[PDB]
Structure formats: C-alpha cells, structure tokens
Design a protein around this ligand. Structure first.
Ligand code: VE0
Lengths: 300, 237
C-alpha cells in the first residue's frame, strides 16, 4: 500500500481519489492519502471551494515513482511532483503517518469497483494520450480538448484519443460504401483493432480512460470519445463474443458508478437508445441494458 | 445549410449545382398472389438530376434487373442513387463538376455524403422546398424512355426546351415547378391543358409544346387555376 503525501492544504478544496471525494478546509492540517492499493492506476483530483471552475487531477501509478502534492500559489493549483530522494520521501511519509495526518484510501474488502473501472487502463497508454515524457504522472482538466476536436499552445494540454469518424475515408472502403456505413465491422476489426489498437485490451483501456475523464472532470471531448467507442462496437455485426461479453461488464460498472444527478449531462440519449434497442448488438448487452432500464429509464 | 425560400436566387447564380430527386428510383406495383398474399413487382425507375440554371437533366434510368436478388430495396435505392450521382460527378470534367448537390429528401444526405467523401469541397445540402420532381414521369417523353429501357442507361435532356432563349433561368424554373406541381395534383387535367389545342405541337427535340410568349401566360394561368381548383376539391373550400 502506497502513499501520496501533501506538503500542506492552503486553500479549501474537495479532493477526489478514484471514486471517493472528501472536503479539506482552508489551512486544515491535511498531509495526504495513505493505503493506496498497489496494482491499479489511480487518479487524484481537485475542485477548489472558491472556484468550482476547473476540475483538474492526476493519473499516476505508485509503482512508477514516489509522488506528492504541493500547492503552488503562483499557478493557483495543487501541483503533483515526483520526489527522487527515496529516503527523504519514506521519512516524510513515516512522520505524517505517525501524526495521523493522512486519510486512508476507504476501500471495502468486497468492493471491486475500481478494478472493474480500470481493468484495461495502463499508465503507459495514458502517457501516450496525454504526452509529457518528462513526467511519470499525467495532468488532465475539464477544459482540455481532443485532437479530433482541434481538427473541427502546449501539446500536453490536448487529449490524443484515437480519432473515430464514421463518415471518413478511413471508415469506408471505396466500393463498400453502403456495406461499411451500415455495418462498421471492417472499421472496428481491421482498421481499429488489427491496425491501430492491436488488441481489444488496448481499445477497452482507452474507452475506460475516456469514461473516467468524462465523469471525474466533466471533460466533454472524453465523453464524445467514450460514446464513439461504444457506438463503433454496437454498430458492427461481427464482433468477437468475448469482446461483447467484456463490453457488457465494462459498461455495467460505468453506469453503476455514474452519479445519478450527472446522468443528464454524461449520457447521450441517441447513442444509448440506438445501442440498446436498434443496433446489431441490441441483444448482446444484457447486464448493461438491465441497469440502464432500472436506473435511467427516462433517458430511454 | 438547408435550401429554402430565403435563399432561392442562389439556384440561378453561376456556381454549378444539381438537384437530385430519388422518388422515382424504386417503383413497384402491389398485387395479390395466387395464395391471396401480397407481393410487389418492380418497374423501371430513374434518378432525376437537374441543373436548375441550365435546364440540363441527367436522367439515369434504373432498370429492374438492378433489384434482382437484393433485400431492403427501399434502403438500397438510396445508396444506388448516391452511387450513380457520384459516378456522374466523376465522369464530368473538373470545370463541369458541381460545387453543391441539393437532395430533395433528407434520407439521401448520408448515402450521398459517404459516396462523395473523395469530393470534400462539394457541399451536400437538403432543402426545405417541396419540389414536385416526382411528377417527372408524367412527362410523356421521359416516361417513354424509362419504360422502354432494357438495360441501365443515362439520357440527357434539357427540361426547359429552348425557353432560355427568351426567359431567365429563374422564370424557367418557376414555369417548370408550376407545370410539375399541376401534373402532380391532377395529371389528366394538366395534360388536357397542355395538349388541348391541336395547332400547338411538341417539336421532336423538345419535351413541352411550342407555346408563344402570350400562350405561355395563358397556359400558366390555366395551371394555377387547376392547382387552386384541386385545392378546393381536396379541402372542400
Ligand atoms: N500540473 C502539472 N504538474 O503538476 C502539469 C503537468 C503537465 C502539464 N501541465 C501541468 N500543469 C502545470 C501547472 C499549470 C496547469 C498545467
């Protein structure tokens, strides 16, 4: 179990760590988060109490370095930094733990939620969607746009998601116009899976990362990407059975975790009604369809 | 964006554009089978592709063999239309290619957009105008070439005959739209109006009769009366 210490907490802020959130008061004696499970990526995220504009946060993996948080009063944000001095870091952490100045990561033993949301998410792939090679953690915020969005300035502040566009020469083989537009299997299996992602694990990793950025930061371009990656599978007549079963599990846990009061802004009615009720895969997502109908029947 | 009454003069500017109407591509008669079920029999159709500035009509005849063994024909018909329009564009010299293609039905937008991906600079537009181009098969010479076709064929016409020698393309299009709306609302009466006087004939190389300017005014008035007459019969006004 690893630790992200904080130098201090000089401004009042709501701090998220994965699916949990808690409030820290201005100058309250808070020195970080302990007991972070090893083996998963994690995100530590922030919304200032005096300006809820800009949610921002960090993707990190404690196996890749010793990370800590320090407020910068110039740039006006809790900045994540790597500590290269290991014995300094261990000594800092041990003292904060002894003084019980840290929150413990609240993981319930039965609870696989975070695993289920990040099953295919790897730091190395996050570091390619968000490019800052100098740093071992990734910084994301509510306002960052995507490469596709910039087709319709510092490179690290753009999300390099894989561009998906159903009316594009990449998606449509000359001479198979109707076939490829009404059945996206070519675009899914040959162009995207075989050609770009290499395997379904990397595709699902990007889909899960897009969802989490949409949920945790309200990042609109990430929400667009999440839905596009769902629609691409649902609109393909030929999808490996293991991919369909895994997609159903992925989406179930995403819909289960989504805050009920954000469903209006985080869920696209057209995509979900098409995917669940009209698409080739309308009968292949039993768990997702059941939770959607019981939790968000208005949308449908 | 969409083409409506606010931007009607745009049809007659110097930017090449084509209307595409697909309402006569897939045509059927519905009938009973020996067992008392219902079946369809396709008949020859046509794509109506019109330059409203010049009158040039690219009439692609859709022979019933293109439907043999296919499913979901009403959907296929939209994609076949888009394939043939794309092939037509590619066959034209660059300086003759349209800058815009206006589809008369919004269901043609995605099929045509996908087929024209290679032409990112050609705008594909819908229209809010309700244009009576479905009545094209009420023009006898057009219906005749479609029904006689034994294979796919493209035939080029000028739908304005020689009218542009005397009137503008705005006035020519308005005449055409009035004639077609009349033929669509009451075909028998419209044809009676157009052919009642045996002394006015249709030249071999034309589609409509050889009316003088003053006779066109009478004809046009008789067509408006027909449209109003049928509107009263329809709504009991
Ligand atoms: N917050 C960061 N590291 O602590 C960071 C990392 C990478 C890219 N931009 C970053 N920030 C720097 C502060 C201003 C907002 C953008």
């Amino acid at each position: 179990m690893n630790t992200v210490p904080f130098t201090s907490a000089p401004i009042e802020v709501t701090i998220g760590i994965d699916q949990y959130s808690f409030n820290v008061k201005e100058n309250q004696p808070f020195h970080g988060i302990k007991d972070i499970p090893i083996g998963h990526v994690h995100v530590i995220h922030f919304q200032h109490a005096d300006n809820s504009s800009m949610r921002y946060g960090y993707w990190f993996d404690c196996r890749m370095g010793n990370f800590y948080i320090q407020y910068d009063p110039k740039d006006g944000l809790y900045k994540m930094m790597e500590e290269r001095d290991g014995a300094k870091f261990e000594n800092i952490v041990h003292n904060f733990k002894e003084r019980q100045m840290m929150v413990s990561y609240p993981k319930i033993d039965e609870d696989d939620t975070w695993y289920n949301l990040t099953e295919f998410v790897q730091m190395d792939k996050i570091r390619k969607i968000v490019r800052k090679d100098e740093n071992q953690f990734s910084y994301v915020d509510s306002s960052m746009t995507t490469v596709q969005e910039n087709e319709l300035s510092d490179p690290a502040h753009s999300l390099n998601y894989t561009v998906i566009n159903f009316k594009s020469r990449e998606a449509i083989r000359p001479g198979h116009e109707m076939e490829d537009f009404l059945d996206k299997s070519y675009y899914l299996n040959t162009v995207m899976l075989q050609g770009i992602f290499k395997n379904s694990s990397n595709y699902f990793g990007e889909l899960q990362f897009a969802f989490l950025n949409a949920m945790f930061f309200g990042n609109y371009g990430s929400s667009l990407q999440w839905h596009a990656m769902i629609e691409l599978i649902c609109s393909s007549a030929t999808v490996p059975k293991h991919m369909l079963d895994k997609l159903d599990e992925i989406l179930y846990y995403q819909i289960k975790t989504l805050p009920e009061q954000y469903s209006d802004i985080l869920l696209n009615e057209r995509v979900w009604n098409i995917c669940l009720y009209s698409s080739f895969q309308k009968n292949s997502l039993h768990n997702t369809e059941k939770i959607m109908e019981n939790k968000y029947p208005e949308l449908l | 964006g969409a083409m409506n009454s606010s931007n009607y003069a745009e049809l007659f500017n110097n930017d090449i554009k084509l209307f595409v109407d697909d309402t006569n591509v897939y045509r059927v008669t519905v009938h009973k089978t020996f067992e008392g079920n219902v079946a369809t029999k396709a008949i020859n159709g046509c794509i109506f592709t019109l330059n409203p500035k010049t009158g040039h009509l690219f009439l692609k005849i859709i022979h019933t063999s293109v439907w043999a063994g296919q499913k979901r024909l009403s959907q296929l018909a939209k994609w076949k239309t888009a394939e043939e329009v794309s092939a037509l564009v590619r066959s034209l010299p660059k300086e003759e290619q349209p800058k815009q293609i206006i589809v008369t039905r919004k269901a043609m937008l995605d099929p045509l957009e996908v087929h024209m991906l290679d032409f990112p600079n050609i705008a594909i537009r819908p229209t809010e105008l309700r244009l009576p181009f479905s009545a094209a098969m009420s023009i006898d010479k057009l219906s005749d070439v479609v029904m006689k076709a034994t294979e796919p064929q493209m035939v080029l016409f000028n739908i304005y005959d020689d009218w542009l020698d005397r009137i503008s393309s705005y006035t020519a299009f308005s005449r055409l739209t009035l004639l077609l709306r009349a033929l669509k609302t009451n075909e028998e009466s419209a044809k009676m109006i157009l052919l009642s006087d045996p002394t006015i004939t249709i030249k071999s190389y034309h589609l409509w009769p050889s009316f003088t300017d003053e006779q066109w005014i009478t004809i046009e008035s008789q067509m408006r009366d027909l449209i109003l007459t049928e509107y009263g019969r329809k709504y009991n006004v």
